[PDB]
Structure formats: structure tokens, C-alpha cells
Amino acid sequence: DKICLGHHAVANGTIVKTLTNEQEEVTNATETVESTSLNRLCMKGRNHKDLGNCHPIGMLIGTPACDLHLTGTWDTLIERKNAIAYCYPGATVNEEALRQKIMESGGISKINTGFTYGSSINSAGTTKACMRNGGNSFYAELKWLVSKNKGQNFPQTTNTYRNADTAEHLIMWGIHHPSSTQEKNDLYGTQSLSISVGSSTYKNNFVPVVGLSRIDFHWTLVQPGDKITFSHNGGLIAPSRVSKLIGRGLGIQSEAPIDNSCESKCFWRGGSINTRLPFQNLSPRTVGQCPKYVNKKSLMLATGMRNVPE
Amino acid sequence: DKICLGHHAVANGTIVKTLTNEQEEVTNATETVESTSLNRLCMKGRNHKDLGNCHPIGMLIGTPACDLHLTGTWDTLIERKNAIAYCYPGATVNEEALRQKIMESGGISKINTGFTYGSSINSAGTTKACMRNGGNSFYAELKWLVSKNKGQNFPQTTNTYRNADTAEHLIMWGIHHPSSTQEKNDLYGTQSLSISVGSSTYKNNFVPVVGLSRIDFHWTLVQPGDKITFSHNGGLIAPSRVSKLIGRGLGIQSEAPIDNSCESKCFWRGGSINTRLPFQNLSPRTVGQCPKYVNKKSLMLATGMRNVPE
Amino acid sequence: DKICLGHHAVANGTIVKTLTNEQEEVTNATETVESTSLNRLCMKGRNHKDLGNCHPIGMLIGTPACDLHLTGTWDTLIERKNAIAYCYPGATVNEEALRQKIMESGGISKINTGFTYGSSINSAGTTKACMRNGGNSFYAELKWLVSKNKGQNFPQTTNTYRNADTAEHLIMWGIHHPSSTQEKNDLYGTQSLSISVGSSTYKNNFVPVVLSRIDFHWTLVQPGDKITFSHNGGLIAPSRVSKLIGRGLGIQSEAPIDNSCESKCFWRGGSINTRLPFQNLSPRTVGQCPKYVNKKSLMLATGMRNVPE
Amino acid sequence: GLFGAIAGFIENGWEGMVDGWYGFRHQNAQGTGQAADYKSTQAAIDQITGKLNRIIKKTNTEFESIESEFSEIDHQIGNVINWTKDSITDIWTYQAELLVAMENQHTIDMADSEMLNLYERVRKQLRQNAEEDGKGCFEIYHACDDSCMESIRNNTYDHSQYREEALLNRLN
Amino acid sequence: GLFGAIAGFIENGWEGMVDGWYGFRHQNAQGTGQAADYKSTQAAIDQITGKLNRIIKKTNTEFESIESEFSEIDHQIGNVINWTKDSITDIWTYQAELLVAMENQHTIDMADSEMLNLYERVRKQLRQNAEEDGKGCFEIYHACDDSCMESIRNNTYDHSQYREEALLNRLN
Amino acid sequence: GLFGAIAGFIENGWEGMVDGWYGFRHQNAQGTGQAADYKSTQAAIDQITGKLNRIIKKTNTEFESIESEFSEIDHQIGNVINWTKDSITDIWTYQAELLVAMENQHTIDMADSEMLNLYERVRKQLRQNAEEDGKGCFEIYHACDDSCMESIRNNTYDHSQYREEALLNRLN
Ligand SMILES: CC(=O)N[C@H]1[C@H]([C@H](O)[C@H](O)CO)O[C@@](O[C@@H]2[C@@H](O)[C@H](O)O[C@H](CO)[C@@H]2O)(C(=O)O)C[C@@H]1O
Numbered sequence A, B: 001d002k003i004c005l006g007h008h009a010v011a012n013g014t015i016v017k018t019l020t021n022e023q024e025e026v027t028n029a030t031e032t033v034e035s036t037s038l039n040r041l042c043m044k045g046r047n048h049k050d051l052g053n054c055h056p057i058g059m060l061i062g063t064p065a066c067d068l069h070l071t072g073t074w075d076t077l078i079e080r081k082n083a084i085a086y087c088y089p090g091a092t093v094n095e096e097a098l099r100q101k102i103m104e105s106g107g108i109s110k111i112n113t114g115f116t117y118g119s120s121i122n123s124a125g126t127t128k129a130c131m132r133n134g135g136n137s138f139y140a141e142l143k144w145l146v147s148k149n150k151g152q153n154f155p156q157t158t159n160t161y162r163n164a165d166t167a168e169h170l171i172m173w174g175i176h177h178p179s180s181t182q183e184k185n186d187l188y189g190t191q192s193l194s195i196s197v198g199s200s201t202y203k204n205n206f207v208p209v210v211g212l213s214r215i216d217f218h219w220t221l222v223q224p225g226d227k228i229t230f231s232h233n234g235g236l237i238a239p240s241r242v243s244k245l246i247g248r249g250l251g252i253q254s255e256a257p258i259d260n261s262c263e264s265k266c267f268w269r270g271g272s273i274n275t276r277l278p279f280q281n282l283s284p285r286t287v288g289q290c291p292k293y294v295n296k297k298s299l300m301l302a303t304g305m306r307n308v309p310e
Numbered sequence C: 001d002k003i004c005l006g007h008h009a010v011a012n013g014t015i016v017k018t019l020t021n022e023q024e025e026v027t028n029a030t031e032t033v034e035s036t037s038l039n040r041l042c043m044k045g046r047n048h049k050d051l052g053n054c055h056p057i058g059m060l061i062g063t064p065a066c067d068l069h070l071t072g073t074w075d076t077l078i079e080r081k082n083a084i085a086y087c088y089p090g091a092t093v094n095e096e097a098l099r100q101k102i103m104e105s106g107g108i109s110k111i112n113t114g115f116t117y118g119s120s121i122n123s124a125g126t127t128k129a130c131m132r133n134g135g136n137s138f139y140a141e142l143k144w145l146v147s148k149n150k151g152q153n154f155p156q157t158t159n160t161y162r163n164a165d166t167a168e169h170l171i172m173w174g175i176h177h178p179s180s181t182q183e184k185n186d187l188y189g190t191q192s193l194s195i196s197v198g199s200s201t202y203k204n205n206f207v208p209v210v211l212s213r214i215d216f217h218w219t220l221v222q223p224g225d226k227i228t229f230s231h232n233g234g235l236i237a238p239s240r241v242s243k244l245i246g247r248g249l250g251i252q253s254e255a256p257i258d259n260s261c262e263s264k265c266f267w268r269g270g271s272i273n274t275r276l277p278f279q280n281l282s283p284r285t286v287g288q289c290p291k292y293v294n295k296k297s298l299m300l301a302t303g304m305r306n307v308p309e
Numbered sequence D, E, F: 001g002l003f004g005a006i007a008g009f010i011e012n013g014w015e016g017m018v019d020g021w022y023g024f025r026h027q028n029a030q031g032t033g034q035a036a037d038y039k040s041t042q043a044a045i046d047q048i049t050g051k052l053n054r055i056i057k058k059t060n061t062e063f064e065s066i067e068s069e070f071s072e073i074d075h076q077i078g079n080v081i082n083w084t085k086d087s088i089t090d091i092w093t094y095q096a097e098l099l100v101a102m103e104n105q106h107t108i109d110m111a112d113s114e115m116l117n118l119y120e121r122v123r124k125q126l127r128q129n130a131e132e133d134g135k136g137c138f139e140i141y142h143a144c145d146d147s148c149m150e151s152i153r154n155n156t157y158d159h160s161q162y163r164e165e166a167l168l169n170r171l172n
């Protein structure tokens, strides 16, 4: 009479690595590194904004492509490739610092600056490069200031905006750099041009060059209580409304389509990552609450004993 | 008849985490993450310098509040909240970079520039903002250069410091940006103002622009055997002495009361961290020889067997 | 009768550290931290380049000290102490960024810009700070543009380079900042001086300052894109542009080269040949290296407890 | 392995036993049987479940972008970010490879230990009524029917009831 | 447990044993007693002291300030500091959780092994004079008085003195 | 140790045994001998070779310089790099200490268990023909010549061939 002790086995066992053995067969194992992702942005439970054709800077200056994104609140802002920031030739100074600041935010709201100009100054300047509703137009949040009569000198004028919202406001203005001298003389006259921007925080001077044209943008933060003074005699593209960035939000840069029928907390250029697994080998560049990137195709965790068949 | 073997136990055990069980009861256990903190800056065996309400930048330019810290040596340098750097309103260019250099240093020594000005110039321009000894004053290491005659314009001037030392020297200077043109004409006359600063490793022009006015500071590093030339004709706030930072030392930013009767190696905003444990729960921002910051309230290390009570 | 089971032992065992005991004796052990280094740059199987006197930036602008290193290919680039970038006084804006970019490349080739100037411009401006072949000279890949008659106004001129290649090109130029107004007027005339550089990618304006120096600036030009220089005195215009080729490892060391030895890890002091996982020579290393640790020794047990007789 | 049972004195596993990890196979006059042991099986499963709960997890730390996907960044700070990310990756790759290798070694040896603890428990039950054959089985020196076998598995075997019959058969 | 004694065949600990970690309890005609084992207790304690001496440490590296407490710093590099500090903090939290979990497992199993080694040492010196009851006790088959009980505890018990009484008792 | 053989019930090692890690020493009428066990020696060596193959490794990640040797780096970037590098060096120093400490603990206890497993293999093979003396030897109660001693080492000792003789001598 005999009683035997023993353990189970399986026909096909999986190979795992131990401290002492690279080829160790076990009854069962499970993967710890994820190597597949959804080719889609999973936005369920997220007040999100897909900018599409709009570039984040364009939503502060009011580019035609950004008309639907001048204002809003969000917890997720999604930027796309080849997005339009400028309808008229030019670029913003300290550009990347601004884009980061907007993509970090959780919403945007406009506050009207209010200031007006003299009767000799035309503040309704438009262009064929910046189309809106069929006809010519301009950056919605700024005004192109030119002389009302062609050739007449642009008046020496001083505009000032005070901050009274208990929170810092982002203000943007542009400087026109004419193509030829005749163009410069047509808009602002023969006089020597000089634009001064002055606050407690910010202080700088700008001068148009001569060499169709372009408009460079500049920006700074006006603190609560403090004023900012613009004195100018032609060349300034002055703001109509300043901006207020609200709170905090998750910026995503991706080409993948949106999907509002599922949830995720981790994103990369190619989509979302929905795994419960601790590690991942899709990309080192990820955003949100993610599994950590590793240089490994697979790491098998044994969930069963050593397999000793037949 | 019988001899039995057994182990000790307790009534009230403690829970610890293992590889295979999040709630495993053991006879005894000790903490590895420090929760408490001493809110006293322990400075025994340390040649330190508490600035008080003196800002690190202030001791280079010579603020009234920084009268007891113009020259000295130290291994530690404590900085406090709301510490005044500038008595006269304004701000230094590249301000945060400069503050780092001073906090990392282990001393400060001064060298006379040896500037002297003609009969027309008055290098003793006091102010109502900067006041020491119950009367109107100015930055100790700088001189406000103005015309002695009120109507007469400021003469063309050239001053040249030479670094005779083997170490690099820190030289600072201010630029007066006047409030009104009536004030500009009173101090420096009707003439067009232009300040040029020139050395082997620095070139920059500084044109002034137009309750009180403001003085924005600038700075650079004069290398050994090199000369720095200040050419100007009204507006320049020239230095009377330059600075040399000595050695290296620990820059602490805190607000806690100082204490010389105890020793410590790790510091943060709220105080000093004295503990033999490896991990710490107080702050990610610390300085010195510190325990490592972890996102954990408690990690109990088992110092006894499994508790199997009766 | 008796049969006894037992294990081996040695007279001289080695001390190792366990989780539970700092002074544990075992029969054998082996070192995991590499403590020694070859005081040599091991360049076997590497198409290398020793710059010697030449600084990496000097290869692009073309200092006399870099005449042998203006063009070439390599998988490893070696830079030395007190290397010469500039013959004339001045510096490059974003200098370190440009240095690192060259020290990642696997070569440099040059392409002619083809720039031409009117009869009233002297394109062959030389200097005594930049000596080459006895007489006065200037940076080989640039040209100092001045007025041909002293005092005359430098004419408004436009030069545009197009990238005809399928890879990006690196273009450099200099902006001369004169010593005094006398010098400014004699070289570039009485007029005000603006220099504009513009492309799809890049746009900037430069205004000379008034002892003497040539500060440098640079940008990349993408395939098919044009970069235009609009100037009237002040521009140190490029006569050639640079294309950085492939990839390679950049080394900064004073140590001598040895072509019989091979290595994948380097540092200031030399090379690190070791199969060991850790290392205590330097944290500043380059290539495929063991991880730096603050420890002199770590012994890995390769045997049981030593319990001698 | 460490405890010398699985891939040790037990020559191989049983593909036939699908209802548990560890168990019994007996032979008597009546014939043969098989039965899984719940206690030891569940101890091995619960410990492995415990590992999965700790290991199959992520941190709740929010990470925002620093590399721009579409626009470019300064070449110096780009290399500082590339150096930092590669250093952190090499750490996580190392820690991941170490973790799994350490845990697998522990899982294999733990499963071996539960096998031995069952074997030792049965050896002490049987006391002087049986002898070890060296291959994981006990040769019981008295007629042990299915109910006697059931009590060995259920841990209700009284050695006193069969002792006098056993010692007679053992000594011969 | 791995070695299968503590929370194993030994059903529970003794709260009345304050003078040590492991020990003995006897039962003879003279009465009942309790006594701690010094060598096995201190072997366990010295192993735990070693863990504490290694773990309860910090690095001697001096770290300086890179984030300002009372002022702002560049947004681009301040983000890189935040990413880096969060990444490093994740590693140290993971290593702390892993260290403590691993050590706790080893401590618990080490302590279990020291219980088993004392049980096996007693088993072998008792030789054929006793038998195991399966609950951590040895049923001795001869009149073992308090002096005989101390010889077992102190490892000076000679089995051949009591062998002939035991072999008679056990066989009938 | 964990398994109680090496630095446990076996009093010490044998410097005379140069041809293996584990082995036998016999005593009979013919005289004395010594022989090393291949299988248990090779089991321990193979496992240690595996550790060395895993640990004696560098990452193949190609790193570049981010601090100039012959030039002053920007002060803000340099402080961050110095903070980062020192944090990375504290992690790897900590990992390298814990790796080696953890692995040395395993190597010792692994070799301890291979001894015990050999000892247990012999115990079960001898069965009721021998008794343990408590210090790693088996007192064999029958005439065991050099071929009989050979058969124990080679794992071909038949217990039933000598069982009748041995029980008579054990009971006596
Ligand atoms: C505010 C303003 O002056 N707007 C003009 C605009 C600008 O003058 C120009 O963009 C500055 O460079 O130019 C607009 O179109 C112009 C034509 O009407 C003109 O015949 O030719 C010009 C070029 O030589 C120019 O294209 C435009 O951009 O739409 C007209 C607009 O009112």
C-alpha cells in the first residue's frame, strides 16, 4: 500500500528568466511590459479641446483658423502637426516659452483692453492674407494702426491698460516691419518711428526695419494693480483684448484621431496607453500617469511553479 | 514524557508589507520614512551668516539693509523671505542667475575701482528711498553721476576698471531711466544720452528712456588681466567698488528661527532634518546631505518574526 | 560502518557583504567595480580624428589652426585643451550648442555659397590677428566685406543661398562690431548699419556696436529653403556653408592615442576597458560605459561560506 | 531547487492533475485514486496573487511634456534632456529586469517549499506506520482503504489505530 | 512559511516567553517548565541588527539648491527640473517599497528557518529515543527527569544511555 | 544559515577535498576514503555561473557629453546637471550595494541547500539500514565494503538487500 505526493504540470510551459537561469520553464507566466497601444486619443471623462488646424499661440492673437478656440475651459488641450498660428508673415519672440505656457493651462478667457485712438489714426486695417467671412480681415485680438490719409505722419499717441482682476494677464502686441520705404511712408509717413513699452515688470524699445511685409509679435505678463504703457508714432499692432490663462491642464501633441468612447491617463505621439502593466516600450516621450519606459521587448513574470513534464 | 519547541509572541503586533502579503503581522517593526521635522536652523560647527532682511544681491550693490554684510567669509549663507534687495525701485537684468552665484559662494571681498570725476560732475547723488544713519543716502558700492550745475549738460566721460587679480571679478552698474523729460533735462541736460560698456568679453549700449523713477541694474564678469571701459554722457550709475566671490558654501533658503546649540547636515524651507533614517516625507526641495524624498506616509521594516498569538 | 557528508573549504577565504552581515567569509569572490583606467585613448577599429590645435567651431568658420580639418569623415572626434576657435577677437552666440552639434557628427563637408559683390566692395579684407602662410589673412570659409575707397558708403547689397542638397546645411556669419566711429566710417561709411538675415525657419536683425571684435551667429537651412542676407556694411559673409554628415562620438581629453587598443567608453583621463558593470573613475564619461558608483570595492560571492578546520 | 522536492526527489509533475497544484495519488487493494490538496494549492496561489497586486501597478505621478513633438528646442538643453531620459530609462530597465528575475526565483522556490511542507506534514501524520521510498511516496505497512487514505488527506489519521499491525509488517 | 514551522506545524507562539525568541517546554513526572534558547535567539537578533546597520543610512553627497523657494526661475528649465525631480522621486519610492518588502520577507523566513534548525538539532540528538507528534514536540519513550531535559537543551544528551528503555517502549 | 547544513550541523569544511564542492568520507573494515559528488557540485557552480552571466554586464546605451571639459558651461544649466548626475550616482551606488548584498545572501543559502539536498538524498536511500549521528554522518548497521560505499554515492544502493541484517543489528 502506497500514497504518493506530487504536483501538477502542463504540456506547454512558458520560459522565464530567474537570477540563476535564463531558460527556466514554468507552468504559467504573464507579461509586464506593454508593446501595443490604441491608435486613438481616449478622452472620456475629460473636458477636452482638439485644436485641429489651430496653433495655441493663434488662439491668443485670434488667427482665422482659431476662431472656434478664442475662449474656453478645459483639462486637456490637444495640439496637432502643421498647425496655423500666423495668417500674416512673421513669428513671436520667445515663441516656445509661450506655447508651453498655453499648453500647460486649463483654459483661456479674454478681457477687453478698452483704449481708443485719434481720428487721424485708422485702427481697422485688414489684409488678403488673413481672410474671414469671404472678405479681408485681421487677427481678431489685435488692431493694425495706420494713418487715415496716405502719406500723413502717424500721431504720437500713448495707450495705457491697468490690471484690476486680482490675477496676472497675458498681453500681446505686434511690430510691423515694412517691405519697402514707399510702403512705410504710405502707412506711417516720413517721420522716424519709435515704439516704447513700459511697465513695472517689463521695459523695452522697438523700431521697424525696411526690407509682402511681416509682423513680429512680443508678449509679457501684467501683474495685478500694475499698469503697462504703450507710446508709439507708427508701427505698433496694438491689442484689443488681453488674455487670462486659467489654472492647469494636460497638453498633448499627437497625430492620432479622437475617441470619446473610452478613458485613458497616458498619451504619446501615436495615441493612448491603457495598460495596467507597470512597464512599456512604445515611447520614452509620454504625458500623464504612465507606465515607465524600458529597453525591453518582453519581461515575463512567473505565476506558477517550475514545469517538469512526463 | 514530552519536550516541545516554540517561539515568542505578543498580543498587540504591527502590520508590515512583504513580497506576497500587504497585511502581514510581525512581533515588532521600525519606521524608515521620517515624518517629523525640527523648525530650527541648527548651525553648530558652522561659520554661518544670517542675512536677516538683506537680499543676497543687496550686499554686492550695497543696500542700507545690507550694511553688516558687505564683506565676510562663511561656509553657510541663509536667505529669508521678503528680504529687500533694492531700496530705490527697479530690478537687475539676469537677476536669478546672479543670486545663485552669491548663495553658492563661501565669502565676499571688495576692491576699489578708483574712479574720479571732473568739476562739472557730482558723484554724491543721495535719495529719499535709500536712507541710512537717519538721512538721505544711496547704494554704498555705487555712485549716482549727475551735473553739479542744474541747467548745464553732463560732460563726455570715460572710466576704466582693470582687474589686477588672478581671479575673475564681478562688476555691477545701474542705468537711470527718468520719469519725465523736465527731470531728464535738470540732471543730464538737453543733449542726447548714450552709455557704452566695453571689455574683452562684453559689449552693450544702454540708451535711457522716458511717484519716483527707476534704476535697472546690469552685470558681467571681468576676467584676470582684463579691463572694462564705461563711456557715458549722463545716466550711468557707476560703481565705486567691485566684488569677488570667495570659495564655495551652502546656500539655504528658509524662514525658521536660527539656533547655534545643535548640529545638522540637511535643510529645507520649514527647518532642518536631523534623522538617521534613509527616507523622508517632508519636501522634495532640500539641500545638504539629506535622506531621499519618497511619496509614502510610512514604510515599516520588520524587526521580528511572524506574530502568531494565542 | 560510517559515511560522512561534507563540503570543501580553503585556508585563505575572502570577505564579502551580505544583507545580514558585513564581514561574511566565503571560499571565493570577484570584483564588480572597475577601479583602474588606461591613460590612453583606445582608437582601434575607429576612423578617428585628432583635432590637436583645432577647436570644433574653427572647422566651420575656418581658422588657420583648422586648415587640415575643414572637410572629412569620422566615427570619433577628439578635442584638446586650449584649442583655437577664433584668431580675431570675439565669440559665437550659442557656442556650446554648436560645439556639441559638431561633436555628434560623423563628418563635415563644405558647399560653395557662390556669393558675389559689386566693384565698390572689397571682399578680401584681411587681418594681422589671423596669420596664414606668412602674410595677413582671414577665416577661410568667410569674407570680410568693406568699402573699396576709405570713407565711402557701403552699398545696399543682397545675397541669398539656396539649399540644393537633400540634407540640412549649417550656415555661419559674423557681425563686425568696430572699435570707434572713425573705424566704422572708414570701412562702412557714415550711414546707419542694419544687417538682416531671413529664411522660412530663421529671421533676425543685427546692428553693429561702437574694442574691435567679430561675434558669430548661426542657423540651419532646410533642403530647398533659401536664406537671404540683406546688408550695408558690418556683415562678415560666408563664402562656404557646412553640412554635418551622419553620427559619431565626441571625446574631450588630453590623453595620447593608441591604435592597438579598442574601447567603447572614454573620459578626460583616458579609456575604460572593462566587462564589469560598475566603475569609480569618473561620472563624466562618454560612449557605452559602466555606471559610476561612490565605492572603492564590491565583492560578489562566487562560492559558499568558508568554514575552515 | 532550494527545497529539493519539485524538480528534486519528486521526479516530475502530473499532467493528469487539473483540479489543483499539489495533491495525492494512492494505490491500495481496491485500486487507485487521485485528489488535490486545497490548503497547499491556495497558499501558493494567494502568495502569487499578492505579487501581482504589488507588481502590476503604476505610479500616480503626473508628467507633463518637456520635449516638443513638432517645434525644435535648443541643442544644449535637448542633449541635457536626452541624457537625463536615457539615464532614467537605464535605471528602470535594470530595476525591471532585476525585479522580475528576483520574483521568479522566489515564486519557483516558494512553490517548491509548499510541496515540501505538505510532504513533511504527511510524514509526521503517518509516524511509524510508513516509510519513505525516496521518490515522494510513502509505503504504508498496513491495509489502508479509501477512507484510511481520505483521513491522511483530511489530516484526521490516527497512527495509534494501525501501529501494532504496522511494526509487525515493517520488522517482519 | 518557506520552512514551514512558524505559522506552520507549530500552531502558535508563546506570549509567556519574555526572556527569548525560541525555546523549549517540557512535561515529566517532576512537572512542567519553560526555558529560552540563547544561541538560536541571538542568531536571529544578530541577523536583524545587520539589516538595520545597512538600511538605516543616508548618502554623504552634498546637494545644492536648484529650485528657488522665494522667487521665480526660467519656465523651460524649471519644467525640466520638475520632470527630473518627479522621475527621481518615483525611483526612490519604488526602491524604498521594494527594499522594505523584500527584507520583511527575508526576515520572516529567516526567523522561521532558525526555528526549524533548533527542531532538527533536537530531533537528531534524540535519535531513536523519541518520536515527532507533528505539532513541534517530541514524545520521549523513557523517564526523562529535569536533568535529562537540561541535557537536551544544552546539547549534551547521550542517546545510547536511554536507548534500550526506548526501543522496548516503542516496539510494545 | 537558512538550511542549517553549512556552518550548521556540519561542523566544518574539508580543505583536503580539492576535486569538488560537496562529497563523502567513508569508514569501513577495508579502511578510509574520500570522494566528491559531481551532480551537487555542478548544480551549485551552474547557478553561480548564471548570476555572473546576468550581473557581469554593461548597458549598450550610447551616452554623450553634456559638460565641457575645457570650457565654462552656463551656471544655471551646470547646477542642474550637477544635481541630476549626483542623484543618478546615488541611485546606482545604492542599487549596486543592494544587488551584491542580496545576491551574496542568495549564493550562500543556495550552496547551503545543495548540501542539505544531497544529505536528504542519502538519508532516504539508506532508509532503515542506517541512523543519523547529528553531525552530517550516517552510522550504517551492516558490513558496507568499498563497492557498497560506491553504490551509495552512485545512487544505486538497494536497501532491501541489507534490511534483514541491519534491523537485527539496530534492535540488537
Ligand atoms: C493695413 C494695410 O495697409 N493693409 C493693406 C496691406 C498692407 O499695406 C501690406 O500688407 C503691408 O505690406 O496690403 C494689401 O494689399 C496691397 C494691395 O492692395 C496693393 O495693390 O499692393 C500691395 C503690394 O504692393 C499689397 O498687396 C493686403 O495685404 O491685402 C491691402 C491692405 O489694405
Ligand SMILES: CC(=O)N[C@H]1[C@H]([C@H](O)[C@H](O)CO)O[C@@](O[C@@H]2[C@@H](O)[C@H](O)O[C@H](CO)[C@@H]2O)(C(=O)O)C[C@@H]1O
Pocket: C125, C126, C127, C128, C129, C136, C144, C146, C178, C179, C183, C187, C212, C213
Ligand atoms: C578689413 C580691414 O579693414 N582690415 C584691417 C584691420 C581692421 O580695420 C581692424 O582690425 C578693425 O579693428 O586692421 C589691421 O591693422 C590696423 C593697422 O593697420 C592700423 O595702423 O591700426 C589699426 C588699429 O587702430 C589696425 O591695427 C589689422 O588688424 O591687420 C589692418 C587690416 O588691413
Ligand SMILES: *[C@@H]1O[C@H](CO)[C@@H](O[C@@H]2O[C@H](CO)[C@@H](O)[C@H](O)[C@H]2NC(C)=O)[C@H](O)[C@H]1NC(C)=O
Pocket: D074, D075, D076, D078, D079, D082
Ligand atoms: C535627442 O534624441 C532624439 C532621438 O532619441 C534625436 O532625434 C532624432 O534625430 C535624428 C537625427 O540624427 C532623426 O533622424 C530622428 O528622426 C530623430 N528622432 C526623433 C524621435 O525625434 C535628437 O536629435 C536628440 N537631441 C539632440 C540635441 O541631439
Ligand SMILES: CC(=O)N[C@H]1[C@H]([C@H](O)[C@H](O)CO)O[C@@](O)(C(=O)O)C[C@@H]1O
Pocket: B124, B125, B126, B127, B128, B129, B144, B146, B178, B179, B183, B187, B212, B213, B214
Ligand atoms: C541725485 C538726485 O537728483 N536725487 C534726487 C532724486 C532724483 O532727482 C530723481 O529720483 C530722478 O528720477 O529725486 C528725489 O526726490 C528722490 O526720489 O530721492 C530727491 C533726490 O535728491
Ligand SMILES: *[C@@H]1O[C@H](CO)[C@@H](O)[C@H](O)[C@H]1NC(C)=O
Pocket: E074, E075, E076, E078, E079, E082
Ligand atoms: C514645478 O512644480 C511646482 C510644485 O508643484 C509648481 O508650483 C511649479 O509651477 C512647477 N514649475 C513649472 C515651471 O511648471
Ligand SMILES: *[C@@H]1O[C@H](CO)[C@@H](O)[C@H](O)[C@H]1NC(C)=O
Pocket: F074, F075, F076, F078, F079, F082
Ligand atoms: C559642478 O561640479 C563640478 C565638480 O564637482 C564643479 O567644478 C563645478 O563648479 C560645478 N558646477 C557649478 C555650475 O557649480
Ligand SMILES: [Ca+2]
Pocket: C104, D079, D082, F064
Ligand atoms: Ca544628441
